[PDB]
Amino acid sequence: GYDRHITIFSPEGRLYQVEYAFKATNQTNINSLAVRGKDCTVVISQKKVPDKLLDPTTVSYIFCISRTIGMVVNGPIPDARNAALRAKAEAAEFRYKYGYDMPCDVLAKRMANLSQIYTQRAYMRPLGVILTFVSVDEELGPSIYKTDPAGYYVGYKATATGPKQQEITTNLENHFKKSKIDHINEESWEKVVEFAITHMIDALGTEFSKNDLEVGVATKDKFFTLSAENIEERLVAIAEQ
């Protein structure tokens, strides 16, 4: 239908185009996880291990946008890259404009506004990726802001994304009620990573190797990716179950 194609309001008044973007962002099947520790923000994504024709390490879904701010991407790769530019770019420009490091909350707001402009542009087809910013924010400390392809955005205590998102959510919900707070337990940055690794394994039911994950960790003034072998230190106690 022509009704499917028009960028301008659909007869329903809720776009077909928007529902479509939502389809897209589950083609790759990346289950990702982001939680807020006490003073640490853990992001984990499946690192696929393809054939030898590609290097496995190089393949990634976790990207360092700026200092403190990391981004996990869910949905197709070429569109991921397109989006990525604009966010890296603005963090720099804000620092020039305003002479201080950009806060997390403000970067997400900018990108919702760009998303909406896309459906007002006739030529342009709306980007069909999930941008979830994680950081140790300047004021607010651990912060999670998940951004939708449509352009809806909302903050999170914890979240997962994927087609199998549903299973992970339940564990995280019940956990937080027993713990009676919103932060994953232990001040220590190291053991919170391990509580995240473990909870990913449970929900999905599949044990993942160091090969099958990538672990990005937020501290004060850096976002950085751990070594392959760091992951293993956690994994080993857990792996016998």
Partner: protein, 243 residues
């Protein structure tokens, strides 16, 4: 569907129908391979000789870029040649400004954004070539391949065109024999055999083998076509074992 009659509409597929078609065209191009070695890269390509009226090694498919980036491409010849030419212009700006040769992943990114825009818009027809590129920059040797999708990744082997199937199988030996990659001189010989067995799938026309390399130990990390005696020798190795 009407998504094939209006570019850059979000399909319920999640990828516009036209862009998909564009990929298919890569296959109609020639077996082109690339081999990542231990201190460089090799590019190798099957160039079908159309007729006796065609002129040896004068419309060579291998094209030089920068002074350290070796480039070859498969699919629409016109589309790719413009793309390679676009690529130099970008590299040019990079050199003036930052006074330094382009890193190979920098080069991939820049090209990546260019493709992306030209598919996100109705106005500009999607690109329909896959490009094998790389060489020896500052961070040493890399082999990357750029999908017309606009994905790119690092690789240790690349193969594309029709006869990629033959090619991938022969590339698996390389990795097992050496995680390093084979020695750059010895890999010239392996590369010829790969193109030649994959010309048993593209035998219907005659072909000429064209190899190039950018290797730190045998090229001083500048780009060069392998010609003359190394090239004629390479053909023999291949001919001898497929007998």
């Amino acid at each position: 569907t009407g998504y094939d009659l209006s570019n850059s509409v979000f399909s319920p597929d999640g990828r516009n129908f036209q862009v998909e078609y564009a990929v298919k065209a890569v296959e109609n191009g020639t077996t082109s391979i690339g081999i990542k070695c231990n201190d460089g890269v090799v590019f190798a390509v099957e160039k079908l000789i159309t007729s006796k009226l065609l002129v040896p090694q004068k419309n060579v498919k291998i094209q030089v870029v920068d002074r350290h980036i070796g480039c070859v491409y498969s699919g629409l010849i016109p589309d790719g040649r413009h793309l390679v030419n676009r690529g130099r212009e970008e590299a040019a700006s990079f050199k003036k400004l930052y006074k330094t040769p382009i890193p190979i992943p920098a080069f991939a990114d820049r090209l990546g954004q260019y493709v992306q825009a030209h598919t996100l818009y109705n106005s500009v027809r999607p690109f329909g070539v896959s490009t094998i590129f790389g060489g020896v920059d500052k961070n040493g040797a890399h082999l990357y391949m750029l999908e017309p999708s606009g994905s790119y990744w690092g690789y240790k082997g690349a193969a594309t065109g029709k006869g990629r199937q033959s090619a991938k199988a022969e590339l698996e030996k390389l990795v097992d024999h050496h995680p390093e990659g084979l020695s750059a001189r010895e890999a010239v010989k392996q590369a010829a055999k790969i193109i030649y067995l994959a010309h048993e799938d593209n035998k219907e026309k005659d072909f000429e083998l064209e190899i190039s390399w950018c290797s730190l130990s045998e090229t001083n990390g500048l780009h060069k076509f392998v010609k003359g005696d190394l090239l004629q020798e390479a053909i023999d190795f291949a001919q001898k074992e497929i007998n």
